[PDB]
């Protein structure tokens, strides 16, 4: 990859003109240095390296903070459905695009702290995050069946290791993912009633990629203690395809509505600098 | 010369003398699905001139006070003949568009319309309660819609409106009116042109999708610059938006589905 | 331990609700008011955090309540700046402790009432 | 709509099963898994029977269960015995952050 060099120019009298131009065509007028003022000769050695989109994807971003504790039977074990939509950044930096096609490289960041002072001390926590895929079934206890994990995914972490990674690949049912979906999933047909065929707009699949289940494997400690498991996430091979105006506003919600923050822009006059 | 064109697609012509050049939007022009690229196992029906053929729809009154229209496909079309069986008969269907805007006016009005040609125009809702326009608003027909200057919530919890309320410098989405150029567009502006011509391929993440759900593409035209005329009183052009459709194939071929309305 | 302030009656006026409770759940949980018309069951009224000095009024009643809180002495309150003759009911203080293992957007945890007060009628009626 | 549809009654025999139904909309049961159900008997504050879906507190028995359907959501109280007589309450969350209680079912032992 290189820039085009900057050519020499003489001075210019002729027909042609490279200043005017018609945007109602829709075509930005491609125009160089060389085309409206007088140029030396310059060898161009920057280059558009950094500005790809792998590398404008290639970071891990915080996308939940999921709280689980250990205690005497309150959160013994939480599940939090698979979503980047909840976080502000990695949500505008993906809705610069409408479709992406990406593999995704999940970071596990695990803290935890004391709760109590009395009640002694305790050994190094276990943590399990279990990948619920869209159908198996959900925990309803942290001791159920349900994590005996023979056919879910699930990372084992101890306490103090290095954060745990994990790949998945390209897991969506379309060539596509859709950041934007311009319609239902459900269209309401005449003769049904008003309780029949309503459906969110905007939503297409209710449960689009399943969910993840953290516990805390050991028994519980007479004292009480929290932890946090922070779940990054950073986008590699990125391929986009239909580029959009970046959000504005602030968000509201999954889809794209707007209540607040509605005017984004400062004051400053026309004729000042 | 370059302003002066002709389009003629199955037993409809249009003609126009003071065009701008017309957008191919993404370089792409439509075209049928490739077997390296098909999902449905099925025979396609692909009814060609009975389907690829300019509708006209409703005419749009543009003024000194108004705000932008918008309209989506293929929901726009979903009244217009044979286009509109096919698409209502078929559970999958995939089309193209060629979008063609008509606005005249004198050489002594003044005025710019963006057109613009958007993938996937999801447009902001009317309350609170996130996501939550339903069918038949979000759905409009032919009449499309219209932007609004500002944002006002429905206070109605008995009988919500569930509408849209989209913003005309937020472009509906939350996202500068000004840096919607990124999207295929053209300019009517009424010193050099009275029309604007967008080539819209089919642009999914499917190669085929229901089109009673899902909408591809959204046209939204807004006042870049105010229309005015000398007289004191008023003024009022009309805004004529004539779109064909393009390169349709249809799979899925069951019993009619009709939509709810009102 | 959660407790309600007496039983009142008149027509027209303001009322103004008062609940106290203990000071962990003072400190770490939300309380949620409910009220309930006789025989004709629940309607949820509001919320009102202590903990981060935030509050929720329920869009029946967004003109007229008002929540405030207490933090020296652990107690919240409630206060009706108009009353109705359809606000007859019996009145309750929740607090919210029991946590649902989903997460709460992508951030928190969401917590449903299962500690309940011992409630205040209040008759609107000349 | 605004609160949630519930059967006005239920009636039921003695060590029969009985199912009260909760139908909401997209945006309280159709979307979000914060769906619980309460118990009132006469002058008593309200208990927690169901507080996600599928899942008890500790103390409530095993014949309390409960399931969702989409758009609608249900309680199964399984082999009826008296002390089951009562109002039962649902309950959950709309997205515009607002809590909704339903009708209540006053279920009755034959």
């Known amino acids: 990859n290189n820039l085009p060099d900057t050519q020499s120019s003489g001075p210019a009298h002729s027909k042609e003109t490279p200043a005017l131009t018609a945007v109602e065509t829709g075509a930005t007028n491609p125009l160089v240095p060389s085309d409206t003022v007088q140029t030396r000769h310059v060898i161009q050695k920057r280059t558009r390296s950094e500005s790809t989109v792998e590398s404008f994807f290639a970071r891990g971003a915080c996308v939940a903070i999921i709280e689980v504790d250990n205690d005497a039977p309150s959160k013994l074990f939480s599940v939090w459905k698979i979503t980047y939509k909840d976080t502000v950044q990695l949500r505008r930096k993906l809705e610069f695009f409408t479709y992406s096609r990406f593999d995704m490289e999940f970071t596990f960041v695990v803290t935890s702290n004391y709760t109590d002072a009395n009640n002694g001390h305790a050994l190094n926590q276990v943590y399990q995050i279990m990948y619920i895929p869209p159908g198996a079934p959900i925990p309803g206890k942290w001791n159920d069946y349900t994590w005996q994990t023979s056919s879910n995914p699930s990372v084992f972490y101890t306490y103090g290791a290095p954060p745990a990674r994990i790949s998945v690949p390209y897991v969506g049912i379309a060539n596509a993912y859709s950041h934007f979906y311009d319609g239902f999933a459900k269209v309401p047909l005449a003769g049904q009633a008003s309780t029949e065929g309503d459906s969110l707009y905007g939503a297409a699949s209710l449960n689009d990629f399943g969910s993840l289940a953290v516990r805390v494997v050991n028994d519980h400690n007479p004292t009480k203690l929290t932890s946090k498991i922070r779940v990054y996430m950073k986008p590699k091979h990125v391929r986009v395809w239909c580029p959009r105006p970046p959000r504005a506003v602030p968000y509201y919600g999954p889809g794209v509505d707007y209540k607040d923050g509605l005017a984004p822009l400062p004051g400053k006059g026309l004729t000042t600098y | 010369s370059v302003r002066v064109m002709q389009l003629t697609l199955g037993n409809s012509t249009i003609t126009t003398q003071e065009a701008a050049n017309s957008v191919v939007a993404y370089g792409r022009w439509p075209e049928y699905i490739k077997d390296s690229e098909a999902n449905p196992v099925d025979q396609p029906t692909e009814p060609d001139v009975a389907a690829c053929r300019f509708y006209t729809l409703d005419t749009v009154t543009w003024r000194k006070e108004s705000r932008g229209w918008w309209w989506k496909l293929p929901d726009a079309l979903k009244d217009m003949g044979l286009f509109g069986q096919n698409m209502f008969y078929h559970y999958l269907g995939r089309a193209g568009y060629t979008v063609h805007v008509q606005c005249n006016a004198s050489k002594f009005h003044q005025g710019a319309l963006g057109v613009f040609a958007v993938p996937e125009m999801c447009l902001a809702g009317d309350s609170t309660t996130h996501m939550f326009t339903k069918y038949e608003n979000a759905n409009p027909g032919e009449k499309g819609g219209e932007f609004k200057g500002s944002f006002t919530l429905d206070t109605n919890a008995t009988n919500p409106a569930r509408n849209f309320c989209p913003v005309d410098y937020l472009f509906g989405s939350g996202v500068l009116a000004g840096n919607a150029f990124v999207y295929p567009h053209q300019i009517i502006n009424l010193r050099t042109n009275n029309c604007a011509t967008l080539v819209l391929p089919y642009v999914n993440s499917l190669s085929i999708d229901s089109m009673t759900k899902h909408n591809n593409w959204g046209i939204a035209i807004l006042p870049l610059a105010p229309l005015d005329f000398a007289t004191e009183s008023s003024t009022e052009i009309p805004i004529t938006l004539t779109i064909a459709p393009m390169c349709c194939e249809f799979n899925g071929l069951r019993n009619i589905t009709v939509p709810r309305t009102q | 331990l959660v407790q309600s302030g007496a039983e009142l009656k008149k027509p027209g006026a303001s009322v103004k609700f008062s609940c106290q409770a203990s000071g962990f759940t003072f400190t770490t949980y939300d309380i949620h008011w409910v009220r309930q018309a006789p025989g004709q069951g629940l309607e949820w009224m509001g919320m009102?955090?202590?903990?981060?000095?935030?509050?929720i009024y329920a869009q029946k009643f967004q003109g007229r309540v008002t929540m405030t809180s207490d933090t020296s002495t652990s107690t919240v309150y409630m206060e009706l700046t108009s009353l109705r003759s359809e606000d007859t009911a019996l009145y309750y203080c929740?607090?919210?402790?029991?946590?649902?293992?989903?997460?709460?957007?992508?951030?928190?945890?969401?917590?449903?009432?299962?500690?309940w007060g011992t409630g205040t009628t209040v008759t609107v009626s000349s | 709509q605004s609160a949630l549809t519930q059967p006005a009654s239920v009636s039921g025999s003695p060590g029969q099963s009985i199912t009260i139904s909760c139908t909401g909309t997209?945006?309280?049961?159709?979307?979000?898994?914060?769906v619980s159900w309460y118990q009132q008997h006469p002058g008593k504050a309200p208990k927690l029977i169901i507080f996600d879906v599928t899942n008890r507190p500790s103390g409530v028995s095993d014949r309390f269960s409960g399931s969702k359907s989409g758009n609608t959501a249900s309680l199964t109280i399984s082999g009826l015995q008296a002390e089951d007589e009562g109002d039962y309450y649902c309950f959950s969350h709309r997205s515009n952050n607002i809590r909704v209680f339903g009708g209540g079912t006053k279920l009755t032992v034959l």
């Open positions: 997209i945006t309280d049961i159709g979307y979000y898994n914060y």
């Open positions: 009102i955090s202590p903990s981060r000095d935030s509050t």
């Open positions: 929740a607090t919210a402790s029991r946590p649902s293992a989903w997460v709460f957007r992508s951030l928190y945890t969401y917590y449903y009432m299962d500690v």
